[PDB]
Amino acid sequence: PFLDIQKKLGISLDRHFMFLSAEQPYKNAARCHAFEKEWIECAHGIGGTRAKKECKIEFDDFEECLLRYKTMRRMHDIKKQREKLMKEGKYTPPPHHSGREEPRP
Amino acid sequence: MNNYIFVLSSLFLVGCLGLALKPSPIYGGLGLIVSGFVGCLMVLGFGGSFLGLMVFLIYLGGMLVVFGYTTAMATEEYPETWGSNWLILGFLVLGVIMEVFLICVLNYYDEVGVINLDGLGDWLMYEVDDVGVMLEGGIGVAAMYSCATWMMVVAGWSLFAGIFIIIEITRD
Amino acid sequence: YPSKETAHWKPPPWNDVDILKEKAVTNMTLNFGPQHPAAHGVLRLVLELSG
Amino acid sequence: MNPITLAIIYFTIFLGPVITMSSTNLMLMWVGLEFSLLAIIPMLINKKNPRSTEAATKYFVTQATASMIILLAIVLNYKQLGTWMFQQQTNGLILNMTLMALSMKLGLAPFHFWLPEVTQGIPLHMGLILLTWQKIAPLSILIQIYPLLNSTIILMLAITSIFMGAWGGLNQTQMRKIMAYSSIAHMGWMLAILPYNPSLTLLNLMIYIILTAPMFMALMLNNSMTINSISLLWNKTPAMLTMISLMLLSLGGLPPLTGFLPKWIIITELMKNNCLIMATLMAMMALLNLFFYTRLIYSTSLTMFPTNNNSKMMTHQTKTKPNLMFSTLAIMSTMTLPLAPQLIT
Amino acid sequence: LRYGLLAAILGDKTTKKLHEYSRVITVDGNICSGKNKLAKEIAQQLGMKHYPEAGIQYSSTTTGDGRPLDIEFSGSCSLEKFYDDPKSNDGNSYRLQSWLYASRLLQYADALEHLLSTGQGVVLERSIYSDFVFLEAMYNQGYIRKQCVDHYNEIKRLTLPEYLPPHAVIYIDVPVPEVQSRIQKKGDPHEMKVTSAYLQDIENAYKKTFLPKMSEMCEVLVYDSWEAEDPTKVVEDIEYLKYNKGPWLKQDDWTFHYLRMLVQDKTEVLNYTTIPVYLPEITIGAHQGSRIYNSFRELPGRKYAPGYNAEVGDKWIWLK
Amino acid sequence: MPSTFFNLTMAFSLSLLGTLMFRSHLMSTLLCLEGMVLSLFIMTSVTSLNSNSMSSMPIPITILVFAACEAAVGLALLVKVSNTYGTDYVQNLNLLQC
Amino acid sequence: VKRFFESYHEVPDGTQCHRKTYITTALGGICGIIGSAYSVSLNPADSTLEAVARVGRYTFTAAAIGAMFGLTTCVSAQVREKPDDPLNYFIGGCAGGLTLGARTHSYGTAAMGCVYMGTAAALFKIGKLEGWELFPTPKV
Amino acid sequence: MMNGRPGHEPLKFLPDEARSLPPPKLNDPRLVYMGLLGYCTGLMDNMLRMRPVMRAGLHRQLLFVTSFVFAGYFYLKRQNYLYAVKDHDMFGYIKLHPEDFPEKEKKTYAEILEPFHPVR
Amino acid sequence: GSARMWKALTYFVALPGVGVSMLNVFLKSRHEEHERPPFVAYPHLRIRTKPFPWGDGNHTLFHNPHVNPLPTGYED
Numbered sequence A: 001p002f003l004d005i006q007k008k009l010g011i012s013l014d015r016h017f018m019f020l021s022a023e024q025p026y027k028n029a030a031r032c033h034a035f036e037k038e039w040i041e042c043a044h045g046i047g048g049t050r051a052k053k054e055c056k057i058e059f060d061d062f063e064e065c066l067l068r069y070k071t072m073r074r075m076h077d078i079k080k081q082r083e084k085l086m087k088e089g090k091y092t093p094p095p096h097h098s099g100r101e102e103p104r105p
Numbered sequence B: 001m002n003n004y005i006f007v008l009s010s011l012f013l014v015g016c017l018g019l020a021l022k023p024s025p026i027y028g029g030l031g032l033i034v035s036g037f038v039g040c041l042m043v044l045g046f047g048g049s050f051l052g053l054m055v056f057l058i059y060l061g062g063m064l065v066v067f068g069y070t071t072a073m074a075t076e077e078y079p080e081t082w083g084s085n086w087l088i089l090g091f092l093v094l095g096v097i098m099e100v101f102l103i104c105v106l107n108y109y110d111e112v113g114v115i116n117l118d119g120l121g122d123w124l125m126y127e128v129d130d131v132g133v134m135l136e137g138g139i140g141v142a143a144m145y146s147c148a149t150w151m152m153v154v155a156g157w158s159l160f161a162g163i164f165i166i167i168e169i170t171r172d
Numbered sequence C: 001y002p003s004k005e006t007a008h009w010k011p012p013p014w015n016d017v018d019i020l021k022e023k024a025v026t027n028m029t030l031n032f033g034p035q036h037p038a039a040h041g042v043l044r045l046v047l048e049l050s051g
Numbered sequence D: 001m002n003p004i005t006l007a008i009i010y011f012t013i014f015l016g017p018v019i020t021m022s023s024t025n026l027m028l029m030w031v032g033l034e035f036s037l038l039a040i041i042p043m044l045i046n047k048k049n050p051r052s053t054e055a056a057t058k059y060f061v062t063q064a065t066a067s068m069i070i071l072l073a074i075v076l077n078y079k080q081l082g083t084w085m086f087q088q089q090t091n092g093l094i095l096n097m098t099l100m101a102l103s104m105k106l107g108l109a110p111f112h113f114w115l116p117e118v119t120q121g122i123p124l125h126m127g128l129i130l131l132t133w134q135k136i137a138p139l140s141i142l143i144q145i146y147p148l149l150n151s152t153i154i155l156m157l158a159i160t161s162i163f164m165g166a167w168g169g170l171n172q173t174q175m176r177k178i179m180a181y182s183s184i185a186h187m188g189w190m191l192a193i194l195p196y197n198p199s200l201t202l203l204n205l206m207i208y209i210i211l212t213a214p215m216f217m218a219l220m221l222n223n224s225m226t227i228n229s230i231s232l233l234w235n236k237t238p239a240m241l242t243m244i245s246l247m248l249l250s251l252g253g254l255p256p257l258t259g260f261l262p263k264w265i266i267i268t269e270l271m272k273n274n275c276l277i278m279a280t281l282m283a284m285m286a287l288l289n290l291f292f293y294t295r296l297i298y299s300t301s302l303t304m305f306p307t308n309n310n311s312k313m314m315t316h317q318t319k320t321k322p323n324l325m326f327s328t329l330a331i332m333s334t335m336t337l338p339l340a341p342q343l344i345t
Numbered sequence E: 001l002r003y004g005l006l007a008a009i010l011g012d013k014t015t016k017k018l019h020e021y022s023r024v025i026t027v028d029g030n031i032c033s034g035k036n037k038l039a040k041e042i043a044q045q046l047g048m049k050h051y052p053e054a055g056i057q058y059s060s061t062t063t064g065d066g067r068p069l070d071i072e073f074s075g076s077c078s079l080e081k082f083y084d085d086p087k088s089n090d091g092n093s094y095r096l097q098s099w100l101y102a103s104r105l106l107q108y109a110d111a112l113e114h115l116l117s118t119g120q121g122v123v124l125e126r127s128i129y130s131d132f133v134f135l136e137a138m139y140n141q142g143y144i145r146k147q148c149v150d151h152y153n154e155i156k157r158l159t160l161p162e163y164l165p166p167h168a169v170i171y172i173d174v175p176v177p178e179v180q181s182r183i184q185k186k187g188d189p190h191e192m193k194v195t196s197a198y199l200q201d202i203e204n205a206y207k208k209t210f211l212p213k214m215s216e217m218c219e220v221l222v223y224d225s226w227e228a229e230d231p232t233k234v235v236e237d238i239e240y241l242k243y244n245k246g247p248w249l250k251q252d253d254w255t256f257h258y259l260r261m262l263v264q265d266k267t268e269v270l271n272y273t274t275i276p277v278y279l280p281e282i283t284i285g286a287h288q289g290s291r292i293y294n295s296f297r298e299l300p301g302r303k304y305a306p307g308y309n310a311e312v313g314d315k316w317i318w319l320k
Numbered sequence F: 001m002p003s004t005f006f007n008l009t010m011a012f013s014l015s016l017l018g019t020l021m022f023r024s025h026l027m028s029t030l031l032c033l034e035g036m037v038l039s040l041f042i043m044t045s046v047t048s049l050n051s052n053s054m055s056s057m058p059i060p061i062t063i064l065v066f067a068a069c070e071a072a073v074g075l076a077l078l079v080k081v082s083n084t085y086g087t088d089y090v091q092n093l094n095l096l097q098c
Numbered sequence G: 001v002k003r004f005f006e007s008y009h010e011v012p013d014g015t016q017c018h019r020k021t022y023i024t025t026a027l028g029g030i031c032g033i034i035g036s037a038y039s040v041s042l043n044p045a046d047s048t049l050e051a052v053a054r055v056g057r058y059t060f061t062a063a064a065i066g067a068m069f070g071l072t073t074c075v076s077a078q079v080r081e082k083p084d085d086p087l088n089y090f091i092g093g094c095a096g097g098l099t100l101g102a103r104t105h106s107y108g109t110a111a112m113g114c115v116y117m118g119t120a121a122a123l124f125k126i127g128k129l130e131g132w133e134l135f136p137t138p139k140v
Numbered sequence H: 001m002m003n004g005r006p007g008h009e010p011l012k013f014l015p016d017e018a019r020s021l022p023p024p025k026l027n028d029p030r031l032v033y034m035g036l037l038g039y040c041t042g043l044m045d046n047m048l049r050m051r052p053v054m055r056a057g058l059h060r061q062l063l064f065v066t067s068f069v070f071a072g073y074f075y076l077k078r079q080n081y082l083y084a085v086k087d088h089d090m091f092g093y094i095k096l097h098p099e100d101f102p103e104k105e106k107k108t109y110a111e112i113l114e115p116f117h118p119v120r
Numbered sequence I: 001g002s003a004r005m006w007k008a009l010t011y012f013v014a015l016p017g018v019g020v021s022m023l024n025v026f027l028k029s030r031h032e033e034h035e036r037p038p039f040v041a042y043p044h045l046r047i048r049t050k051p052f053p054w055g056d057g058n059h060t061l062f063h064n065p066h067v068n069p070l071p072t073g074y075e076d
């Protein structure tokens, strides 16, 4: 904040819901709760410039956790290769992935 | 039932496209209500019923007031709809054609980017806690009564002030 | 600095209140009756209403 | 206008920017700007003239569009990073949306086309409140995100702001439009110095405010609406021509006035960051700003324009309009240059 | 300025101090027709404050010492010179007319402030709503010109609607030959140097413009000479008037407060009478303005603000 | 979700195009503003339900409140424009240029 | 287009005069369509025919200025065989100014364009030789 | 640019470390100039409200002078504190990174060979 | 108008101000139960060069046994 009345008086009008692992109703953690928890405690006390450099590992895990850009490419490459094999007929679906499995509780 | 949310959001885009093409404000309100209904169903599709139903009801009331004002003073002798001018239908059909062209380009050239046909619907619900109580969207807005004191007081003061604002504006 | 595209401007009024032409009161004219339950059948109430 | 609505509207006018500065959240800074806009609309439509209606409508649509581009940037950041802060890795597209929206919030060129229009047709007190108070909360948000901004588009926005402001100030005769174009040039200066050090940005903001308030007050004393109206000030109020000249020279940035100090230290740090071409172009356009200031001084103080008959009863009557705050702000806006190291952090 | 927003919120309500006799009654008539005695007797037997006709030296008599100041301080316009030569090439006629209108505006502000502050009604003589009669009489007699008429109309448009119209407008109908006979009887030679065409222009401007405009927004009290000439029937009718039209009905406490602020700040009363429209009849120039202003400043009691002039006996300057 | 979020972003872009490209109806301009309001609400809500950010669920309701109060103020201003001129046409609001 | 405008600086001056003229003509055309779009938006024409005519006139004028500026710059550099010299860009700047004056039909604008565009192109050459930064990243 | 330093109290005028600084001597050109500015402010106020310039409002001129010296003294204490911590952080960085600030061996005018340019 | 203004200031500013100051002292006087300081026979305190012209000459006019020790100590 441009003025720090919030830090001076110790009150928290909006500082308790800045991000995902902040105060959540009935202890329902948000998605990527641990991952950006690691990002904050990596970046705390070292400044913004140092946060971008030596906390690149923790940020890249969280950025791909929330957006799933790399994971969608993995699942699409599974599906794109799979239907490529079905056109040539050198692959068959298993029973449990085609709808006839033995369910478990 | 995988491209349901996608055809919903395409309906939202064409409603906003008609609103941007700007017919007479009665038909603009018609497009805005059908787009608000689409947005309600979209929020319902991605999750809790509370936010979608509230935005739906609020814009029922809001464009109720708006349509009252279009009948009041935002009117002319011959209203222009979408089909009143050849230009408006022209930009409407080029908007639909450009939307189809853009989604085909994003499907083909960029592969897995913002739009993926093979991956459509596979990334709709990311993670939901299967065993658990109090997960709906209304519980958070309810906790805004307790956890968000500052949000409650600024919203209440905004509406209070705005009552005073509209009184002084329409004081005449 | 008067040019051709800006020489038509007038200086703003001293009290910022402009003189406008009094617009015609667009009042609705309604034929109340004669085919009306409250007009007793043969009354042509030309009614000049605002709202 | 009763005291109840006066208190509500004035308290909301105060509360908006204070919420924006004090609040950490992008959402709360946006709603503080929103508070400021809703609070200041009725006072623009306070006089109930068609020009006031035009000014309020233009101001409202411009501010609403800027607010929604701000809100787009905030929601896009919250999608990208999951937080409510442009922290370090927010997208440059989002930041450019924020910068365009905040520039059109402020009224600097090429988003400057509404500011003379809005400040015209409104009373002088609300023009003062606009051109001083309304430009702190966007500066609060801009100062909050100084290292992340794109210096190229910052400098381009700044230099075109000063160019358009100087040219408009040269052309216009109405005092409110003159003040608006002076505002545009000064916001160009602050926006240019913004990425390198926000301390000099705040220093230039305070210097601009403390120069603009008493000049507006001198406009309030007789409702001197035009160059001719401020020209017969020698017959209306002759004891203030010297301070009018000094305030306009300080607005021009002539040494040894303290209004030279913000331009001088901004140029100093611009050379510290090696943008000499930028600083030179900015300084010559500041000279052009000083040109229309000097022409205004020539009209109002150094020459004596012809007066009319009823100014005799203007001299007959007595006035207590100049408040206690005018002289202090004028002296701090005129003779503060030897306190430059104390003014600079 | 003790009156303000704080005084209003602590309680200075004009509707609270308002009562039945708090009316603005303006007596009007021709150039010499029973006007001064009627107004003063109406005020005397109604308990109202009487304001006589605002002359050239009205501001001189109401500001500072109250003595009539010298002529180039008080406008450099002479009614006697206007009577002697109405078509003089210097531009005396429109200068006098604009000066008289602005003095009437000052008197109207004084009367409105007195009514809004004390609650006592006012009986004006020939207020601002009936000075365009003299404007149009000079214009139709060829004494002044169309630029002067336009300048007067612009000033009237700027200043007139910011105030409230009078509660009652009393008119005195006296024919032009009777007016001329009374003028001959009074004995001022400049006043006998008037024209029946000018007097007929005055009466025509009355009957064709002034009476209908006040008829649609206040109570009009046309009286002839013998219906006048005995100021008791007019007072009885004023007592039994019913004010059911005009903008006075919709006025409330805060509108009264803002009107009171505007009429107690004389700078914004006389602000729009000094518009810089450069008309040669009205504009003066730097050297003559400087000489007149410096002489006014070296006049006794006018060098500083009132209460700060040590030469007139003001005390405790160093502690205020 | 990425397709829907991109599509909602283009919905905001089209409504901003409508707002920036005026027609003779200030009411239609305000309606384009409300279309932007819808798009912002839906993107905020779907991000909240995607991330399960139960503490950020107040954000759509807050922007709902503030933007509909914007709508109320704009409607009052449009009533003032119509009382001035008889129509809400934006080319009648062009005499402050001088 | 960033790779394009970087490929302008790939070769020293006086070589690929056709390429330099083409790229400077393209940059002038971009500046012209921006300026013409601003002109038609701020000051609307009475019909779309003369509107697009005004766009075409501004685009052709700016493209001609850029074309003859780059052409004269390259030919002057290779006639004087002195590649890194600002006077060649000054001659090109006056060629651009004379094109502006010819399109505007006024020798006063021609001479003002000569002096101003020659100074601008000369200082551009000094900047690109001695490493001046127009929009620097903040370093202190 | 120094608001992010460690141990920075939020919205604090003069912290306790500032009490380690020498105070201004209360008769220095900065405070004397601030008092003269207050006197000029009072004189300007008298002229603008159209009173005698120095014969009127003596208590007002006194209050202006006192308020100006008060504000100037406390602002001067804050600025000396800020410049002190600026130089302190600069010197601390210098001793923290000595390899980035090597002590150059400046060499005398017996082995440096400056060019000579004759003016003829 | 002056008399009304002063009446309003008395009723809406002065009386509420005295009410708040009285409430402040009244709440403090219920929470504070002061730990009588230990007696120290400081040579500059409780000086008696001549007896007082009342009582025993050793008690002050407004003596309070709980808080005001004699030159010798507290009385309890």
Ligand SMILES: Nc1nc2c(ncn2[C@H]2C[C@H](O)[C@@H](COP(=O)(O)OP(=O)(O)OP(=O)(O)O)O2)c(=O)[nH]1
Residues within 6 Å of the ligand: E029, E030, E031, E032, E033, E034, E035, E036, E037, E053, E079, E082, E097, E100, E101, E131, E134, E191
């Ligand atoms: N030309 C001109 N003369 C005016 C104007 N107002 C007043 N006068 C003149 C007319 C008279 O000669 C003089 C006094 O005005 P009156 O109408 O009160 O005349 P008088 O008192 O002699 O007669 P009375 O018994 O009151 O009707 O002022 C004005 O606006 N224009």
Ligand SMILES: [Mg+2]
Residues within 6 Å of the ligand: E035, E036, E053, E125
């Ligand atoms: Mg009389």
